[PDB]
Amino acid sequence: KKPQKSKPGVFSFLDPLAYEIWMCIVFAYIGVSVVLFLVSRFSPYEWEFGIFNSLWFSLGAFMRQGCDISPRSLSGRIVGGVWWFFTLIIISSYTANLAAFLTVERMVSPIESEKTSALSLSNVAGVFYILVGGLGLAMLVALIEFCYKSRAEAK
Amino acid sequence: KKPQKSKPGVFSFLDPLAYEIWMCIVFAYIGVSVVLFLVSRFSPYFGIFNSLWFSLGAFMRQGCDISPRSLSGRIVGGVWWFFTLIIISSYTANLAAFLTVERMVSPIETSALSLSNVAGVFYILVGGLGLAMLVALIEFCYKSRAEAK
Amino acid sequence: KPQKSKPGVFSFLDPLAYEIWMCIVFAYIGVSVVLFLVSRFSPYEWEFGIFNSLWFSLGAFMRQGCDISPRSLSGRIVGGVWWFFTLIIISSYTANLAAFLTVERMVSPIESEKTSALSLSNVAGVFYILVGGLGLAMLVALIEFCYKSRAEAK
Amino acid sequence: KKPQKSKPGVFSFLDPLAYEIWMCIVFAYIGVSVVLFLVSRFSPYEWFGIFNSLWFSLGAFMRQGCDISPRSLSGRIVGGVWWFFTLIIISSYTANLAAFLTVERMVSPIETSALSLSNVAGVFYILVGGLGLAMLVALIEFCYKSRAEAK
Amino acid sequence: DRGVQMLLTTVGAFAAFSLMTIAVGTDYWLYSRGVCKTKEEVMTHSGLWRTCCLEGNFKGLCKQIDHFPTAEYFLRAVRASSIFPILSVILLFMGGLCIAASEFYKTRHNIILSAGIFFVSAGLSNIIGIIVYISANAGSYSYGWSFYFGALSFIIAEMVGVLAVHMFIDRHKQLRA
Amino acid sequence: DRGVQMLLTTVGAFAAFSLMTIAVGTDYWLYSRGVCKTEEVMTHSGLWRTCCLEGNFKGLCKQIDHFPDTAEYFLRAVRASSIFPILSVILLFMGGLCIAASEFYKTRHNIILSAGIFFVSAGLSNIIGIIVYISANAGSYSYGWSFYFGALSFIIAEMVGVLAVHMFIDRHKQLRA
Amino acid sequence: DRGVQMLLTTVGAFAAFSLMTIAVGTDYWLYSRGVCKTEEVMTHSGLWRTCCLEGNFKGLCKQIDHFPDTAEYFLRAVRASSIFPILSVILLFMGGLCIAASEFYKTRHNIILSAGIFFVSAGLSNIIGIIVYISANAGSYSYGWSFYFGALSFIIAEMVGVLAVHMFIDRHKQLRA
Amino acid sequence: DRGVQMLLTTVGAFAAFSLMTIAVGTDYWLYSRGVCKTKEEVMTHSGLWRTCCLEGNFKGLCKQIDHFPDTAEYFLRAVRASSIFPILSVILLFMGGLCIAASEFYKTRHNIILSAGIFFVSAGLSNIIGIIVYISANAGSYSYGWSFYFGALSFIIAEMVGVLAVHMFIDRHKQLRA
Ligand SMILES: CCCCCCCC/C=C/CCCCCCCC(=O)OC[C@H](O)CO
Ligand SMILES: CCCCCCCC/C=C/CCCCCCCC(=O)OC[C@H](O)CO
Ligand SMILES: CCCCCCCC/C=C\CCCCCCCC(=O)OC[C@H](O)CO
Ligand SMILES: CCCCCCCC/C=C\CCCCCCCC(=O)OC[C@H](O)CO
Ligand SMILES: CCCCCCCCCCCCCCCC(=O)O
Ligand SMILES: CCCCCCCCCCCCCCCC(=O)O
Ligand SMILES: CCCCCCCCCCCCCCCC(=O)O
Ligand SMILES: CCCCCCCCCCCCCCCC(=O)O
Ligand SMILES: CCCCCCCCCCCCCCCC(=O)O
Ligand SMILES: CCCCCCCCCCCCCCCC(=O)O
């Protein structure tokens, strides 16, 4: 049968980039956050980037979201600048390759031996599932912290 | 048949995404704002209006006044940031797909984007300015009356 | 034959019609003024002045800084709609430029592949604007300094 | 002949813009940083240093940090035109990359789709090189300070 | 004032519960162009459970949706069952119970928090359910009034959750003064 | 300084009103190749009258017929009746009256505030008018001096509104102090 | 809670070193489909030996032939000699050695900083090694548990580096008192 | 220190001026493949003024580039025909040098050092405009020669020296406030 267009899979929003790019993005995120934490607060002569704040900074730099704090040191600024460059390239390339995917549908036969349509909710359902899962997780973590700190109030 | 050039809709700027995606975006925005408010203020140990503002500014890839400092707040903020990035990228990519395909259509044998294409966003903008002015004046009249007569 | 043309200075404005640019400028002034009014007009609450409102609006459009964000309901309404407007307009600019650079459509003036990298000739105008702005900035700074120096003598 | 699949360059992420655009972006960055430093801190009647000017300009180009913005008319002029320049140049980068990938996708010969790590590996090399450099600089400063105590 | 907040929370809880229950029950989710019963094409209610014929040879015939003919299989499982809309109804019911028990067996002050958490969770469950429904359908049409009853239920549930949390905050505030 | 500001706002109000009134009156909004009173020839079209130039019978002016989806009908109505340019003129007039009445009744400062709100609203009406005009035209050409008179009226109206609000803030600072 | 921190860091250092060494020595990095020692059959290729299975003479296997524009030559050279995975192993070893020597010649509290630096650098080397590996593979497939052992070594090495730096900070904090 | 700062400023000013003057007079800007002398295509020098020929049957021959073989294009052609921007860069660097020289003599004015800083910054801006105009004018393979990179290095050094001058002026007015 002629290779009809495939139904968009949940988590098809990751398709523009190869699995290896995502995996290396995660490794680069951890490395950047750790090096920013190290460089920012290791010398006794410096004594706001703890490990948790370094991770937050890096995450929000990647998602081109807020800043809240910027390194003031030479070295922290080196780290921040290369992470900013990386982020710009990777996000631009994600958007560009997604545009390429949506512009030209390129069907391939499973075996060998146009008036473009609005994205449907099926095309991004996965990101909604992740969002609501994260909201549930956030509520759970908050309630755990509150129950713990309540027991600490008992004794 | 004659070409019959099609007039873009006033709100054709919403065309890259299905109606259900916009609907679910609004539901997601309310959910995110409410959960951010609960995980941030519920512990005796970001009010609702500030949480709505945070979420709005996060979606428009714009503002950044305050950001959550707690673990739970940061989980909420992080997922919302991811969601925003995917949705906005997908909007721009699908708009580019629309315009590219419409540009490679050859009939049988300018290209800039016209004010007709983005008119609705101007209408919304000026409507919002009017609403803002009205709200300001209502608050001011209320405050003038509030002083003990 | 049509023979695809050499890109003009100020061709970076080509993705949007002249009317869109004009109305963007009008909307910018309107937004700045209304933000200033709805923020500094109640005596019942006497940062968003006229020049700080203009700066806020400018930076919101260029998807850049945020010194201050309106804290009132009304200023937040204004900011939110301006943010929406900005997002749509900039997305639309990028998308239409992509369409232009993907498919080339040469037009016959009278009727009765390999997608090269982008050359300095079709962003030259933005460089000219930048350096002109730097010159203007230096001029303004020097005028202010000369004025302050002369006044301080008295 | 066999189709001869192309091997992407390491620094292929620079392909969307000509070499001269990158060169002139760097020159423009230096110029903007210097002029912002000059107009901001030059008049007795005020007293953004050079390093802070450079940082401000970089995070405008990367559409990132917003630590501090100019408050004077001249600083604001410089900042505004640099923001304009950055908007145009980054939009143009993304648009031309999309053009590259879209055109390369509709080629049909005579008779994977995602972007591979090879297409961006150079940006990872730069990232890790920058992290190494940052650690080196931090340790150099720490050694300097630790050796600068009175003995 | 404080006195009215309990009324607003309780009436909102009841409204949300009633709307979600009606939506889960009624059949006007999707005005599709479907088959009245198999072994031609007309407008059909196609609710959550039963698709019911209208404007046809025999208007009014209602049949059970044939949900079935691995991710797609799991989505079919989650959609054929309405675990998420049903869970929304259950959580709204438990939230209402917590609000009711706010007065009887008073002064616990964590029952109000439980009410707020239940209402917020009901909202989240509702949204997941809506997304599952819409995803399952596609791959013309319109959305009936039961669908928008579900949507309005979500909105009201979130508002009532905010009120409940606010009331809990105000108690634990007075307490410290 | 003070004393100059009142004169400057008054002059600006008059300038904005005169420019907008002229713009609504005159007919050099658009230079297009249309048809004269009923070939092709250049025709300065306005808000009301499309009129013929550089032809055998230049200077012959005809009323524009704005008619042969509901949005199309409503846009055609809103553009046929230049409600938004006219409302801009009316609001500028009312702002001028408020500024004039400022000299009397000076003890009450809310009349110099009203003046600012009227001028700003006039600017917003002007923007909507320009957008509807251009949009309706879109469903070679150029814009004439009438169009740019409308644009300059918008700019001056916004400046004058800023000045009016500024002086209301001073007046209320002197009485705060 | 110092004391348990030292045990946790030592365990982590040992785990990272062992994982990275196993990953380098073992050859289950890539489940390709290629030729065994010189029909296409599956293979558990590794860093050194492209090794055969489910074949005519399975289990007999050879040294990968790395070699058949200086950039291509340089990348092939860097991937032939697994300089970056090996350097990761060496740096993890030196980090562990520093942590061990943190008991002897105590009170320096400046070698534990070196331990942190070594672990961080080992992680960076590891990531470069992964990138070169995957890049050179592009000159169906899957990744084996050796690849993931390398990845897990990276993660644990970064955690241990953070702990080491934290302990150095705490030591100077105590000293400054 | 003040002495080291002043020496470094002076050396930088001289280096920038020398580099820009060499660049604006020498011919190795663009290794294109043009025509040695006309009215067979081979490699060329193609400087700012004269396109000498190389690797051809006759080498070393130079003709003045045929400027002017669209008013928007006409103005760019005119601005490239002269080198108003490279030349103006050279002039501004020279005037900055004069200011720095007048720094040591007739000193305590404190506004001539500022003048030097402004002139160096302006020279840098002129230089960048010149480079953009040049590169734009040649869009109608190739490579850039060492004279082009001399121009570029001149820009960088001029900006550094301008920074030094401004920083040095700020000190004088800090001292003159303590
Ligand atoms: C105060 C600020 C602190 C410092 C902030 C640093 C962050 C900015 C770095 C960006 C990437 C730099 C590297 C750009 C890559 C160059 C690669 C290249 O030139 O490739 C040559 C190619 O082969 C053709 O010649
Ligand atoms: C420090 C504060 C913490 C903030 C934290 C914020 C979270 C931000 C990221 C969310 C996306 C992560 C989820 C990505 C899920 C990918 C789905 C997947 O794994 O793909 C499925 C399969 O591989 C193919 O079929
Ligand atoms: C807490 C502070 C709150 C700040 C508040 C300001 C934010 C406003 C943002 C966006 C408005 C967008 C309005 C969208 C209107 C589109 C509706 C529409 O047109 O839908 C019908 C459609 O046309 C049928 O085809
Ligand atoms: C509040 C203080 C802020 C200070 C202000 C900061 C600068 C604003 C940003 C960009 C200016 C862009 C200028 C655009 C120049 C356009 C040139 C143009 O339009 O020329 C094309 C020609 O019309 C075709 O034929
Ligand atoms: C900045 C750090 C986090 C950013 C979000 C990154 C998302 C990580 C996803 C990792 C797994 C991706 C799997 C896709 C491949 C596949 O579908 O087979
Ligand atoms: C966080 C807010 C995001 C912005 C929300 C934009 C407004 C969306 C509202 C729904 C509009 C539906 C448009 C589709 C109309 C149709 O085709 O029937
Ligand atoms: C935030 C508001 C300012 C944003 C920057 C807008 C500057 C561009 C305005 C140019 C005017 C229109 C002229 C170009 C169109 C043309 O002639 O083809
Ligand atoms: C300030 C933003 C960062 C950008 C800096 C990038 C500098 C790149 C320098 C030029 C190298 C790329 C040119 C490719 C050459 C070729 O075509 O072979
Ligand atoms: C904030 C930026 C200000 C914008 C500066 C705009 C300067 C360029 C204006 C060009 C107008 C061209 C007239 C078009 C003629 C017509 O078709 O009517
Ligand atoms: C923000 C600072 C970034 C600076 C980046 C510097 C990178 C320099 C690389 C220069 C490569 C030049 C290639 C020569 C090409 C040619 O003309 O043949």
Q: Which of C18, C55, C86 to mutate to test the pocket of ligand 7 (most atoms within 8 A of CB)?
A: C18
Report residue G44 as tokens: 């558990």
**Nearest of E12, E43, E45 to residue E122 by alpha carbon:** E12
Report residue B119 as tokens: 């008119």
Please indicate whether chains H and G are in contact, defined as at least 3 beta carbon pairs under 8 Å.
no
CA of F150 to the centre of ligand 4 (A): 21
- What are the residues whose beta carbons fall under 8 Å from the beta carbon of F165, sequence distance 6 or more? C36, C37, C40, C41, F113, F116
Contact list, F135 vs chain B (CB under 8 Å) = 115-116, 119
Question: Hey, is F43 helix, strand or coil?
Answer: strand
- Residue H42's φ and ψ, nearest 5 degrees, are -140, 170
* Cβ pair B111:C88 closer than 8 A: no
For residues D61 and D51, what is the distance between their CA atoms, to the nearest angstrom? 16
Read off the DSSP letter of residue A17: B
User: C150 and C122 in one domain?
Assistant: yes
In a domain, B6, yes or no: no
Contact list, C89 vs chain F (CB under 8 Å) = none
This entry's atomic model was obtained through cryo-EM
* Residue type (1 letter), D123: V
Contact list, C115 vs chain D (CB under 8 Å) = 96, 99-100, 103-104
CA atoms within 13 Å, Cβ hemisphere of G1: 3
Question: Hey, is H33 helix, strand or coil?
Answer: strand
DSSP codes of every residue in E5-20: HHHHHHHHHHHHHHHH
CB atoms within 10 A of CB H39: 5
Domain count, chain D: 2
* Cβ pair C98:B103 closer than 8 A: no
Nearest CA to ligand 6 atom 18: B19
User: B134 and B80 in one domain?
Assistant: no
**Nearest of C101, C84, F150 to residue B118 by alpha carbon:** C84
Size of chain H in residues: 178
CA atoms within 13 Å, Cβ hemisphere of B116: 17
For residues G173 and H19, what is the distance between their CA atoms, to the nearest angstrom? 53
User: B62 and B21 in one domain?
Assistant: yes
User: A86 and A25 in one domain?
Assistant: yes
User: C32 and C102 in one domain?
Assistant: yes
Helix (H), strand (E) at residue E52: strand E50-52
Report residue A37 as tokens: 């934490």
User: A104 and A43 in one domain?
Assistant: yes
Residue appearing with tokens 């968003």: C48
Contact list, H128 vs chain C (CB under 8 Å) = 127, 131
Nearest CA to ligand 2 atom 13: A130
CB distance B8 to B118 below 8 Å: no
CA of C117 to the centre of ligand 8 (A): 12
Nearest CA to ligand 6 atom 16: B19
**CATH number of the domain within which D95 lies:** 1.10.287.70
User: D125 and D73 in one domain?
Assistant: no
Atom of ligand 9 nearest to the CA of C21: 4
Report resolution in angstroms. Answer: 3.0
What is the least distance, in Å, from the CA of C53 to any CA of chain F? 12
Comparing CB atoms, the residue among H76, H122, H136 nearest residue C120 is H136
User: B86 and B31 in one domain?
Assistant: yes
CB distance A104 to D105 below 8 Å: yes
* Cβ pair F71:B10 closer than 8 A: yes
What is the least distance, in Å, from the CA of B139 to any CA of chain F? 15
* Cβ pair B94:A127 closer than 8 A: no
User: B75 and B22 in one domain?
Assistant: yes
Atom of ligand 6 nearest to the CA of B23: 10
* Cβ pair B133:F117 closer than 8 A: yes
User: D92 and D148 in one domain?
Assistant: no
For residues D112 and D90, what is the distance between their CA atoms, to the nearest angstrom? 27
* Residue type (1 letter), H105: F
CB distance E19 to E153 below 8 Å: yes
CB distance C52 to C68 below 8 Å: yes
- What are the residues whose beta carbons fall under 8 Å from the beta carbon of D44, sequence distance 6 or more? H173, H177
A62 CB less than 6 Å from ligand 5? yes
Nearest CA to ligand 8 atom 10: D19
* Cβ pair A85:D55 closer than 8 A: no
Contact list, D27 vs chain H (CB under 8 Å) = 128, 131, 152, 155
User: D54 and D97 in one domain?
Assistant: yes
- Alpha carbon distances (Å) from E30 to A23, A120, A122, E41, E73: 41, 16, 17, 15, 22
CB distance G141 to G28 below 8 Å: no
A136 touches chain E (CB under 8 A): yes
| Overall fold of domain H2-176 | Butyryl-CoA Dehydrogenase, subunit A; domain 3 (1.20.140)
- What are the residues whose beta carbons fall under 8 Å from the beta carbon of F108, sequence distance 6 or more? none
Q: Which of D19, D64, D125, D127 to mutate to test the pocket of ligand 8 (most atoms within 8 A of CB)?
A: D19
Atom of ligand 2 nearest to the CA of E71: 25
Angle between helices E111-137 and E2-25 (to 10 degrees): 30
Q: Could you confirm whether domain G4-176 is CATH 3.30.70.1150?
A: no
- What are the residues whose beta carbons fall under 8 Å from the beta carbon of A1, sequence distance 6 or more? none
CB distance E115 to E102 below 8 Å: yes
* Cβ pair A20:G134 closer than 8 A: yes
Q: Which CATH class for the E2-175 domain?
A: mainly alpha
Question: Hey, is D77 helix, strand or coil?
Answer: helix
* Cβ pair H166:D27 closer than 8 A: no
User: B43 and B84 in one domain?
Assistant: yes
CB distance E161 to E10 below 8 Å: no
Ligand nearest to the CA of C78: 3
Identify the domain containing residue A54 by its residue range.
Answer: 8-109
Helix H, strand E, coil C: the string for chain C is CCCCCCCCCCHHHCCECHHHHHHHHHHHHHHHHHHHHCCCCCHHHCCCCHHHHHHHHHHHHCCCCCCCCCCCHHHHHHHHHHHHHHHHHHHHHHHHHHHHHHCCCCCCCCCCCCCCCECHHHCHHHHHHHHHHHHHHHHHHHHHHHHHHHHHHC
